[PDB]
Structure 1
Amino acid sequence: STSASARSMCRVLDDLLKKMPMLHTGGTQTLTEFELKWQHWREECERHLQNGTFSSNVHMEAVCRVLLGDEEVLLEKRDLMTTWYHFLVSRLLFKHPTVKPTELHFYAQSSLDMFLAGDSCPEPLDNILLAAFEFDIHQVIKEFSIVSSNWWFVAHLTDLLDHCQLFQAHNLYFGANMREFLLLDYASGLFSHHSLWQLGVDYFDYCPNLGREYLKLH
């Protein structure tokens, strides 16, 4: 409505964006409908670009070049995206309809690689996120316990992994039961203070082993 040379352009853009797949449910989770919608969207975009209704304008041409799925254009316009996870989700949205867990780690690794190549530096949190994307719960919680000293976060993560009914480790890479060690560490850190010692009682009652003698000594 503002620019006089963009009415039909925005109309064509809105008509093209209507073919976006918003997770169809034709009975169950089907990827065929998503793939067909993505193919139809790509075909409509290519047809518009070849006809000319989506050309002869620098702004919309750059928009289409970004939507097609490139890397150098996004590295130049990095002021819009956030970090490596934003780059990865942008690639997965503008390059493929959907991805599988067998290729998600590969795509995330390639995203982090080209993001670091395009003027960047390594980062411990970035490496932790890359490990989380590469899965292996044992090694990601090992990296978490190595880097971050927050015992409550590791305790919550172990509780979630136990609630999810997954195979967990019964040893703390030296003794046994990681949740008991985390609760004992939090109890020590809380007793280091001079106030609030009520949660330690229940956290020691939850441990039917060293918690009794620990509370009796504290």
Structure 2
Amino acid sequence: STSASARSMCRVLDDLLKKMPMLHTGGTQTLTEFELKWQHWREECERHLQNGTFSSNVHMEAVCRVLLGDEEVLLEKRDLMTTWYHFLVSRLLFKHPTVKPTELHFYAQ
């Protein structure tokens, strides 16, 4: 409402956050559809940024980079995290939402 140019940017972001992929259970939860739709969501964010309804602003571009997973931006945002376990949970939330103990150690390292 305040920024006319950023209003479209905010609407696109709000639409993306409204269409966050969630669990898929038809009697048993399906991780496959889960990662597929998350990847498609990442693709949609990239296409929004390329179309410019999700770009052209430093904050929005940084947010899209973080959503796709951007280590240097997170490490610059080390203030808002302040903790490496928060770093770990952000990394997993933004690149590997379905983690196994076999890779938890790699990601923690």
TM band (smaller chain): 0.7 to 0.9
* Distance of 1:52 and 1:32 partners within structure 2: 30
Give the conservation status (yes or no) of the 8 Å contact 1:66–1:74: yes
* Distance of 1:97 and 1:86 partners within structure 2: 14
Q: Does 1:51 align with 2:51?
A: yes
Give the conservation status (yes or no) of the 8 Å contact 1:19–1:37: no
How far apart are 1:77 and its partner, in Å?
1.1
Residues 85-123 of structure 1 show CA distances to partners (whole Å, capped at 9, x for unaligned) of 1000100011123122211111111xxxxxxxxxxxxxx
* Higher RCO, Cα 8 Å, sep 6+: 2
Q: Which moved more, 1:67-76 or 1:83-92?
A: 67-76
Superposition pairs of residues 40-189 of structure 1, within 5 angstroms: 40-109=40-109
Q: How many residues align?
A: 109
Larger Rg, first or second structure (1 or 2):
1
Give structure 1 regions of 4+ aligned residues with deviation exceeding 2 angstroms: 21-26
* Distance of 1:68 and 1:61 partners within structure 2: 11
Could you tell me which runs of 5 or more consecutive residues in structure 1 were left unpaired when the two chains were aligned.
110-218
SS for the counterpart of 1:54 is coil
Could you tell me which runs of 5 or more consecutive residues in structure 2 were left unpaired when the two chains were aligned.
none
* Distance of 1:71 and 1:36 partners within structure 2: 23
Residues 18-47 of structure 1 show CA distances to partners (whole Å, capped at 9, x for unaligned) of 231333322112101211221111110111
TM, length-normalised to structure 2: 0.88
Give the conservation status (yes or no) of the 8 Å contact 2:21–2:41: no
Larger fraction in helix: 2
TM, length-normalised to structure 1: 0.47
* Distance of 1:77 and 1:22 partners within structure 2: 27
